[PDB]
Amino acid sequence: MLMPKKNRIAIYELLFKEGVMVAKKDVHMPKHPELADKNVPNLHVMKAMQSLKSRGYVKEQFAWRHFYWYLTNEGIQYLRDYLHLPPEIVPATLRRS
Amino acid sequence: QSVQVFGRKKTATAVAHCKRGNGLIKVNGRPLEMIEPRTLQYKLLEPVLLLGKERFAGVDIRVRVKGGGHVAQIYAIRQSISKALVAYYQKYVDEASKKEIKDILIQYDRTLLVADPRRCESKKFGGPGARARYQKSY
Amino acid sequence: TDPFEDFEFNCNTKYSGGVTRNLMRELNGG
Amino acid sequence: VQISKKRKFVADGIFKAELNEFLTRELAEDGYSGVEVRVTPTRTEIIILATRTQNVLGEKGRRIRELTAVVQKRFGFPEGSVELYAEKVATRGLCAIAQAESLRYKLLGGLAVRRACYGVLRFIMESGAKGCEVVVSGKLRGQRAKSMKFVDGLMIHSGDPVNYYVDTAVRHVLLRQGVLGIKVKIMLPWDPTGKIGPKKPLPDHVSIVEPKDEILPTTPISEQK
RNA sequence: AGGAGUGGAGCCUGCGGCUUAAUUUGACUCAACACGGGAAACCUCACCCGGCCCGGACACGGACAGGAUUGACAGAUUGAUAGCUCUUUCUCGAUUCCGUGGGUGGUGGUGCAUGGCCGUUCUUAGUUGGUGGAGCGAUUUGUCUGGUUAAUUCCGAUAACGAACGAGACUCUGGCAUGCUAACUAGUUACGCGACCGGUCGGCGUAACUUCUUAGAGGGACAAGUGGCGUUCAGCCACCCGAGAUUGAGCAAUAACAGGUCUGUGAUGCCCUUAGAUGUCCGGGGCUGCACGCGCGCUACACUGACUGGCUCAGCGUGUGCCUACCUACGCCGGCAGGCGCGGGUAACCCGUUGAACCCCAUUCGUGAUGGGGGGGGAUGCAAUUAUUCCCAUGACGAGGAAUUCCCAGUAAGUGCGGGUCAUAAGCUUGCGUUGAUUAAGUCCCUGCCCUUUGUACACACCGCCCGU
């Protein structure tokens, strides 16, 4: 869980600005595919993912080398509380019904 | 439109386009009796002394050849020449001596009019070749 | 729970009597 | 810009494999029946169909948007390049997963596996399927893992038509000591082709027609049209 | 009957005890060894180190918030390259710490587990109801003495009749444009030139109204033709014909093996699984270490041929990839690559008429172990090393340890072309050509499976049962 918190809040902010996000699990990569040109250690973010899935707030899923999130009303509400997001933000995935 | 019944031996196909001419024959830009191995020289010689020069003096024949192997090209060139001669000399002039020459052909070698049907056999897994299997370990 | 095939794959095991009794209970229940 | 055919066919195979494994991993609870994918110019789409139409469509659209975002973000798909179409059911030539799910979620809540086998067998042969096989592998009575296979009806295995008379689904049910793994196979009905069963008559059987009765002529009888 | 006929001689990843921690298994005699489609320092070791992060959420104890992985420089220093133990110093900003039970890193514990598909008994021809007949019944007949057939394939007899799966038909594949669907980009006779002055250049011209190799339809062959044999039925043989009078594979029973795969997989038999290390971080020694020790892998093994090239022939294997980057024309230095723009193309366009293989030898080796296989370097990747992957040298074997190996017409072998690792092939393998064959139209012997009758005190079924001291 040993990633400095600035990347944590950045990832949470981009998560809620986009909705769900993807995860590739590997230690041999130099730089993240989507998060390239930043040099973010993958192990720390992986530990953060397994911690939040063990903490019991996003339904933990191990799906064949490629991970996704599980968004729900409870998960979105908890992310809002944890990131202290303003009470005006709505995700772009629910646009126009 | 056209028959052009050609000739095939194994995978090697040779076609003899025959038309009105002087009777001389060419095989792939080349006359006949200069084959490099020159062991099947008489094999290509066969038709000319089988049917006679008196029938090979009024038709220009051009032979095109393609297909692997030294011998495989042969047994098809002569077949192509023979069948082109049958076709041309039948469609125009007469049918009695047509029967004569085709009968001479048949009694010498049936292959000169009708092609060899049998070809290669595909290989199945579990062995080196088609029917042979690998050595069983014991 | 179904007595019909319970009897069909238990009549050789330890539970032959119970499944037979249940199957006969289904057939004539009175 | 130009691309070959074999390589993109294999890439589409990759995409199909991943989407189908993910689908069979999640959607097994909500009664889906038939799922496919389709292509429009510079556009890919996924379509689903079931007896529970709006249930599979989901509530609040959570399933739709969530899984579409998943595929969009995983498979390099540009945003918006995936949508869901609509369809309808022709007939019952593909009726296995409804009863399979029924038995599965009866057993999950407490139910004997073989009672479910009885029920699924009887419903499937009431539906009109030619034959059905259910192989439950594992421990049912005792610690010997016997592959309890239950067959009913006819099953051919030999011939060119035999390529297109099989349907298969897979599931599992839970005991604490071990898992009972249920494969369900169904033979397809030639008679209810529904345009899927071959229109052509069965090869071996020379499909003959009843002759037509008529009066054998004795005196000439002539009609004017 | 016959060809390699193996192993005999140095000649695969795996391989038996295997001395050291290690050169081990996850498969064990038609069910272990090209095994997880391995060109082995690794992802091309699981057995090995230590720095590499210490997965703990969920009731709550500790100053009742600062207990620093993340910061390198000639002395500390289980690599000075780790803040890991020298009196010494440090890079985020709330989240390292210890605990009933959860999490897992699943190559290490079992397979006498199925996530499901495989392999197999088995591709030998077997298997099963219904109604009827026999029997008190378990059961039996149908499913058979006979002939025939590749076939439980038919005919025939017939207390059985009628059906089903399997066999077959069915699909594709060489024979099938001897006529029809018709592109110069692959080929298509006609069209003064070039060549000596009438005959070869594939560099050029009727946009020829496609015979070729490029293929959608359609056609053909059926034991119908004849002769013969047959209880004259099923059928069988020969002959005349025809491209073809049996081409190969594909699909392949019911039921089972106490088979393989959790090493395709986080559902699943599990004491160390309280995140103490198999990889995350390092790759050293070797499955390249030696003795019958199980493994087709062994090209070639000499005057049939080894040399040098005068030489003349379709692989119809295929070869430019959303987070892809690995396929030398035009000129030259060179034994390979190396290139300087530069491999013509996302392909029948570009490799191309893909000149690869026994051959008229283009100096030599006329009978012998010989001309016959035959230790330093210049350069793909982080590292040539027990030459993994080019240059000069110091050249057993006799048709070969006793050898549960395949094969009956384009077939055994030779040889060649490629695809699996692709950083450049594979000592195997998978497809395809070329050269191309001698015995056969038979039989149960010695090998296996199957059937009938028969015996049985066996039923876990002879690896049985069982008697006696």
The SS3 assignment for D196 reads: coil
**Cα separation of B34 and B26, whole Å?**
11
Question: Do D70 and A20 lie within an 8 Å CB cutoff?
Answer: yes
Q: Which residues of A touch D74 (CB under 8 A)?
A: 22, 66, 68
Range of the domain at A61: 3-97
Q: Decide: A72 and D62 in contact? Cβ < 8 Å.
A: yes
| Chain Cα centroid distance, residue A56 | 14
Resolution given for this structure, in angstroms: 2.9
- CATH number, domain with residue A79: 1.10.10.10
CB contact under 8 A, D114 and C6: yes
Q: Classify A34 as helix, strand or coil.
A: coil
The approach used to solve this structure was cryo-EM
Question: In this complex, do D65 and A66 lie within 8 Å of one another by their Cβ atoms?
Answer: no
D172: nearest nucleotide, CA–C1' criterion: E267
Cα separation, B125 vs B107, in Å, equals 43
**C-alpha–C-alpha distance, residues D100 and D94, integer Å:** 12
Task: Compute the distance between CA of residue D74 and CA of residue A69 in angstroms, rounded to an integer.
Answer: 12
**Chain C environment of D140 (Cβ under 8 Å):** 9
CA of D160 to C1' of E234 (A): 29
Give the CATH fold of the B1-138 domain.
Ribosomal Protein S5; domain 2 (3.30.230)
- Report the residue from D18, D22, D69 with minimal CB separation from A19: D69
Chain D neighbors of A63, CB-CB under 8 A:
22, 25
- In chain D the domains, ranked by start, together with CATH numbers, are 1-90 (3.30.300.20), 91-225 (3.30.1140.32)
Which CA distances in Å does A59 have to A16, A54, D155?
17, 9, 42
The Cα–Cα gap between D117 and D177 comes to 21
Domains of chain A: total: 1
